[PDB]
Amino acid sequence: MKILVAVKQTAALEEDFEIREDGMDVDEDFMMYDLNEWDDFSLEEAMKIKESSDTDVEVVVVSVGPDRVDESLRKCLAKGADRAVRVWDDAAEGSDAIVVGRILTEVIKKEAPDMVFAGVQSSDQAYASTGISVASYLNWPHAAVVADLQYKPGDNKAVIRRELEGGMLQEVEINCPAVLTIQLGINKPRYASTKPIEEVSLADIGLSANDVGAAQSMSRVRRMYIPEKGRATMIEGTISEQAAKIIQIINEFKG
């Protein structure tokens, strides 16, 4: 019994970041990298399933990305993931959600897991696409935005709740194996912020430069730019006068 968890190391930007000379991305010098927030919850859900079971449950984390990503995979192993896999070649640079879905599927084919978990979306690009693209290439049952999972290892069905707009959920019975995208709040991850990572090349999974990268993506980036955004009226001063302005605004509202 095996659960495969696809994880992304996302980038967040420091203040005063700049667009790189070619205009296709932000300068990497302004990026801070960490595990995608949604992956904390999906990894925790796999671990909860592992701990609730007397049957062995292998939890395998997999990420497509350059060598910086090993730091995040190492942290997953430290939380009790059994194995971690990084897939990369430089040709994979610029791969969108659909191409990454394809690459992930080639690993999943070899791992032959009983369930695949992915996050609802990434905190950086927020495509909300990668996990369900994997489901297409696998041709597996799937559901997106899973906030509850009733599943025991080896069951051929599970019952999920998907989190809908406007304060409601929908219970859905889904055939297993399945791909699920996992929403924030499904559990309370316990670790709130020597076994090597397995390194896999495109060649290892039967792919070449022609299968991946920007040229095989389903849209082309023309440019990335810092837009003009709306601007607040910043209240400067001491805490006391900032509070005084808020009260005046409150009073204006009340009268």
């Binding site: 980038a11 709740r161 809908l164």
Partner: protein, 319 residues
Amino acid sequence: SKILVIAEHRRNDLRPVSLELIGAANGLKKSGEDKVVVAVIGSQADAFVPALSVNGVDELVVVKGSSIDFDPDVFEASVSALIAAHNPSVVLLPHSVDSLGYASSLASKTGYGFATDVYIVEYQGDELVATRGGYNQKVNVEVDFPGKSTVVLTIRPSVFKPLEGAGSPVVSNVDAPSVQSRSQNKDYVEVGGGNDIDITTVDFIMSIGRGIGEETNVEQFRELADEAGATLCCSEPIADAGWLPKSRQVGQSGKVVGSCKLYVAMGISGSIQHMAGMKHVPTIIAVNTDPGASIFTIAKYGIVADIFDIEEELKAQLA
């Protein structure tokens, strides 16, 4: 050419994002002669033809599949057959929880252009140019779809304006392709937790986010809210943690605060999903120590200061 719009309904009600997409489709088409085709999918979807017989709809296709409401196998199959039948240049879906269940699967099988959560779209000549966000909404990413005769976009809700008035589409009925779904929908559910206030009805909200830190810090904001005559609401992490009831959560998964005139957002970054619940509020005050927080891009007033220091001074001045 044709632009195909996939409408959305749930629990017998048409979701208003449907009409936004029709607005988007009509604004996008290059020529008077181009047609907007709207599809509504469900076993009881004929009920929605009056509500979709509106300005800017040239053709309305009622697709009867096996499920009442959204099912990802049913939808992917149906939309794939709609694309085949109508050969649209552009297909518009809502960036909704339903679409998340199938949009990218649809795009993986075929050579279709694809981008999600799009909030600017136009033709430059015959070239479709779409804009979405990058790096937690800190940039715009502008994309095109070279050589793609069909492009599927999911469209950010509450960006594109609906048209006004009725329409007279050519209405047609089709059966969805006959393939058995690998899931079955069961009950809709609203989860437990206190529900003493309907936050869609209140006019003055103080809302707390992850910036409050530990659960022990909730009480001081409850006290502030009470002293001010505001209703205490929150962002998702507070409610997910069980620190305030889900009924107080503002945003996509929570509630839209339609009656709110004054919203004080304390320790909330302003994610897109939080904004969905409160960006319409006429006077928004944000209190946040990160000047780069998205919330300041919609706030009327901003205070780059510690929320605990602000809360305590506010309380003292109010007394």
